[PDB]
Specification:
Helix content of chain A: 10-25%
Function (chains A, B): Decomposes hydrogen peroxide into water and oxygen; serves to protect cells from the toxic effects of hydrogen peroxide.
Pfam families (chains A, B): Catalase (PF00199), Catalase-rel (PF06628), Catalase_C (PF18011)
Shape of chain A: globular
Number of domains of chain A: 3
Keywords (chains A, B): Cytoplasm, Heme, Hydrogen peroxide, Iron, Metal-binding, Oxidoreductase, Peroxidase
Family (chains A, B): Belongs to the catalase family. HPII subfamily.
Distance between the termini of chain A: 49 Å
CATH architecture of the largest domain in chain A: Beta Barrel
Subcellular location (chains A, B): Cytoplasm
Bound molecules: CIS-heme D hydroxychlorin gamma-spirolactone 17R, 18S, hydrosulfuric acid
Number of strands of chain A: 20
Structural class of chain A: alpha/beta
Strand content of chain A: 5-15%
Largest sheet of chain A: 10 strands, antiparallel
Oligomer: part of a larger assembly
Chain lengths: 726, 726
Amino acid sequence: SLAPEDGSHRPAAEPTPPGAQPTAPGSLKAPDTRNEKLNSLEDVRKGSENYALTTNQGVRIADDQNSLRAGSRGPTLLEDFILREKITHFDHERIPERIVHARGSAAHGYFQPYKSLSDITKADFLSDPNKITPVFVRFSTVQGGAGSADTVRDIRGFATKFYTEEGIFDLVGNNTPIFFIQDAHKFPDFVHAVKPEPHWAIPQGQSAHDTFWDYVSLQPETLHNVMWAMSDRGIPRSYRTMEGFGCHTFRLINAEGKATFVRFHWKPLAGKASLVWDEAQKLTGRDPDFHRRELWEAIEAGDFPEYELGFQLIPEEDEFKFDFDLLDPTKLIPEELVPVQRVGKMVLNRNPDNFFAENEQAAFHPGHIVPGLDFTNDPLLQGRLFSYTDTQISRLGGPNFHEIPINRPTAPYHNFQRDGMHRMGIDTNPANYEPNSINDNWPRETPPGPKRGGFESYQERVEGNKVRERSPSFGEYYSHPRLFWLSQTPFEQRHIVDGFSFELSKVVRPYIRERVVDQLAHIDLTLAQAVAKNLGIELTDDQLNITPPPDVNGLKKDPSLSLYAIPDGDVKGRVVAILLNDEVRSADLLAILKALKAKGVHAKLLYSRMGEVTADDGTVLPIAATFAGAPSLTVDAVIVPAGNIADIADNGDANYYLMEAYKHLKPIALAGDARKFKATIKIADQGEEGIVEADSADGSFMDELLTLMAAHRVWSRIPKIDKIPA
Amino acid sequence: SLAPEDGSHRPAAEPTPPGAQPTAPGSLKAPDTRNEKLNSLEDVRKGSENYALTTNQGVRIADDQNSLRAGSRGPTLLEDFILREKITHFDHERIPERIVHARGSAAHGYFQPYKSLSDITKADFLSDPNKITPVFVRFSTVQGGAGSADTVRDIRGFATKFYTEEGIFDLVGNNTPIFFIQDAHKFPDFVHAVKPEPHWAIPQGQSAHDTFWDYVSLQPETLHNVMWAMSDRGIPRSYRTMEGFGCHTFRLINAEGKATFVRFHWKPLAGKASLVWDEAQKLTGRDPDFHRRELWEAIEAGDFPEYELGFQLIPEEDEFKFDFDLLDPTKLIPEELVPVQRVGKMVLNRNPDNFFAENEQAAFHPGHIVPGLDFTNDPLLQGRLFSYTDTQISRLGGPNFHEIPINRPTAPYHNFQRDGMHRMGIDTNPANYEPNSINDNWPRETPPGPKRGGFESYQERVEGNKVRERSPSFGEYYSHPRLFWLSQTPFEQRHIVDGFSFELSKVVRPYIRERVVDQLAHIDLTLAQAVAKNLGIELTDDQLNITPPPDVNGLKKDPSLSLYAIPDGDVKGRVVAILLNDEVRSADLLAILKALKAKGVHAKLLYSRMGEVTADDGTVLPIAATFAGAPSLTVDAVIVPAGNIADIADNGDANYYLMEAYKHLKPIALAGDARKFKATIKIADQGEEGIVEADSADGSFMDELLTLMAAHRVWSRIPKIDKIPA
Ligand code: HDE
Ligand code: HDE
Ligand SMILES: [S]
Ligand SMILES: [S]
């Protein structure tokens, strides 16, 4: 026995808040959570307790500490098969990462619709509010490698595999409603431009380099998604607090054969929330795994990520009723024009057991549709259909990638396909072709119908010549960027300007920065002047006189485009740093934790060392982390209880903690003598909005702090931060 | 034409300092830097200017902006082969990354010996000081993926491929002289324990997690290399400023067949220098590509990385003359006992053209030796010899990885091996076996001899039974950790304590922390006590009474094991930040830049925005980056000239620049009214060692600053930084 006698090596198999226990594989941490897909993976789950260590051939190993040698200081012998198996498996552990979205984090859950949608789609998973469909969801960045950092500025992927009774449906979305380019033929161009440059393979996880901005300046169709990426949308607080979108118009097909155009939405029920850029960048350094960790810890604590699936629905006869083309994936459909209809709820409630086997090996692909859904001619979607099947032949080693356990349907699958590398299924059918008589033609085709029918494409009319041509209707590039900009709050606008400015400051060739500023002048003059000023660029008289693009279908803003214009805060699952001293006032701490508990807000107790300290009244307080070990970047607010403040008052790290949190617009609360820290962040004696202060930590002190947390950040503080050296 | 009229898109093909020009592929940046290997790659280099865009089959493309569709808003057609080839290639761009050392950065150069070594080795590349051998060198971290950050705390790899006239010799080393484990059979255990944990794949690029310290606590053989990793060895300033080691005793074999034991060394002619932990960690977020960038830019500037190759030579009859086993790779050979003989110099003078083709596909392997070298029974080297050939079969797709251009020998190669995936060589030999008559037995075996002979192993005597057993002589784990400890300066010792303390505070299971502290008590009580205090652990009476391990062959320290005990500073190729204002005193700047140029030190001119400012005398000064865009993390020292200081006096970012540089022990120099900044870093009116100040930037001011820079950091400042909130 190497485990400690008190059993403190094994995490509690029950919900526990972040940091309370070591994290564990999902089937050990939450054995009681189940769904149909988790149950079906049981055949390949492997345990360990009480088993002998063996080769992969089942031979027990006696000594796993030494190679076989001729004498104990001699050479290693070729006959050591146990060594060579073990090192050969090690030597071949890695598979190619995904060409894009290589960095991602995943969990299991389930989906249910609020009511049957049979009047608009025959898709089985949407036919009955009692039908529960297991899901597996992977969130991701786009540009960086599997080993890159989470809180980079980038677009985020949001891919859901629905294991339906009529096949796998993968909804392969992102956290913005559009993409940078119009036609799939340019995807390698755009992706090569944003990826590390090919001579030296720099930079990782960043669009802040010459080739990205060269491409953008030369391809104005990109400006809409670039506006999103440069906003705080590019730096979400959590995968739990971002929106998801299906990116294209698809179709729903009902049993009558009626097509309705649809765009897909995910609404985060935890609300929308983003970091600020200096915080996101610094966090890539202090914890490059912060989003993967926050997602896994949320599920272990029971703060299950929840999302509402929604549909924007457009009748077929309304195809041409807008100012933009519905097939143009650089255009959004404003919610003011077409509201999102709520469809159902998805909950993510179980982590995987083994990251490589369930996360790294999962394959999502938007061609994976089911009866009741269909495509459209969006020319970016159209090319996606080719890529997601193709790429798996190298990434997952061949055409049997659907036999890798996480990718297996739970629906029946039978057909005449055979062989390929890694073939698991042993087919007993006497036939491997159809039509056949020797197996009475089974498995058999199934006609389309209202349920459980075969897939048939909607009979869309096609007319035109074979051309490599962009539709003229896609040739408008500035109105949607302008609608987005005008929909932002003034502080969201400032952060857009600061994102273009920082990024273009990293472009070495100045003419590329000038060309991008020229494009901005076509969108909005105020935005363009503000960026130009930060770059030392002066707009020409011609630039100052560019007519702004038209409004989109009479709209001059749509508030659903803003993260923050309309409050949608939720504090459950947020975290507060509590800065301790060597003689904490226990009554303050009891009131702080009581109020945080009641709203499902977590806490981390921090000090200048590990171990414990003892409160004024003898209560032993266990320290979670040092000030330096768990920086303010990792929390949503900071509370300092009263007590022996002298203990930490001249501690550089403790003062800096509050300066960093202050700069990043987080709520800060100081009780009693902790008010002494007001001097480090230059707060006046009469106080200021966003700093909660009182003689003790209750009556209204925690209500005030929790009201600040529900509004996420203290935006009114922005003018005060440029003066603080932090 | 899309390029700017003024030609400013194209970097000059001359050496230029960092930031002066965009970086470029090495054959375009330095077209006349040549060596036998670079010239031999010309057969596969492809250019681009003035050529038409084609498929891979040579068909010219007319429209590389669109897919082929039926109508300009129609579906994409399967007959679009141009689209499918382009997206197929993109879909399969990625290959598996290296199992370990996936993150690395590489360059070309050459090696030449100082004298003939024929008396001790018949290796041809060491036979004459006129023998110039091309090299390709890849530096790397160990744990993180190819997209992880450079300035993590980790061991670093230093792998050199010598293209000799008698074969490739790969010297595949690290930046410490030992490894964590004794026997190759435990490599996958150790690497699994340091790598991200298997449930959730966290953390990236860090040993600061429970499974690493669990293994270390249970395997005290690891403690010696753990001491090195927790020292500032684990966070080098540059690949140019760290040592390399071949890790194992190999043999040199001379023409007479005499074997001498050898351990290999690389000594950096730029001297030894490392970051401090806070700076390294923050730098992973501010610039995760910092070491890759600094290496590429150094070579572009002509600050070519230079290392001296060195041998520790031990006669065969001296095998048992030490109190440790020469075959145990957890033991170092102290230079006080066996000096390093300096044998030649390697210079890296050219970056690659295409990172993936030359860096990512390069394969190094320590079994790639040449006549005049041989192995020993070191049980970690023995197992390595299996792994480095095996792993390439998945990583590089098959057994023809020596035909990938960067890997090809420049020496002749001819044999009877045939076929394999993507076989390039077309053999004309009528025979593919030997002995054969039908080609008169060619290519033929060559007997061993003094030059141009075949390889024959040294006829070492082997006597023993077939056993899986560790030599009892390997069973001592504490004397080398203690020697290394006692050889460090008092500030290097504090940084080791801090590295253990920070790492163990991130281990969630407290008994693992306790088990590590127990091991520390076996090494040195002062170290053990200092770590324990940071963790809130108290040593037991038994722990306080553990007898220290013995000295190593009577040594109680060896200053060659310290980074800084013996002065070894070189400022050429270092970089200073100069913080501008909107009316700079020009005389200060002329003097600063003149003195920096004379010593080969670079500068970066920083301000609050991009563009330019104008000095008091109307000199226009171009701005390289903002204060926030290029933080103090990225420079060796900071200089603030006089002028309109009030322009920046209340700039939070400018104040913080100096606070962060101060906290990180960097020299800071303040001229005239720039001395008003003393107040932000709490410098007394009378001054402080490490802060250069004068009325102006005269001759003595720069000499003082450059003297501080030769000493790298201001270690005497350490007691003052605890109070600084930065
Ligand atoms: C023609 C335009 C085009 C093309 C060709 C592609 N992409 Fe992807 N994209 C591919 C190609 C690849 C290369 O096949 C790849 C690489 C690995 C793989 O299996 O598929 C992939 C990954 C990917 C994920 C990760 C899924 C996971 O977590 O495993 C997510 C969420 C998205 N995508 C989302 C997405 C949207 C939202 C609408 C839009 C638009 C696009 N993408 C554009 C697009
Ligand atoms: C049994 C003990 C053992 C075993 C089995 C291995 N390692 Fe490695 N190591 C391998 C295995 C692999 C898996 O073959 C792999 C992974 C991909 C590959 O092709 O080779 C590899 C890479 C590697 C590089 C990068 C070279 C480059 O830039 O590509 C460097 C610099 C080092 N190593 C240095 C090193 C030292 C210096 C002493 C010592 C000791 C060891 N290692 C220990 C060791
Ligand atoms: S999209
Ligand atoms: S080693």
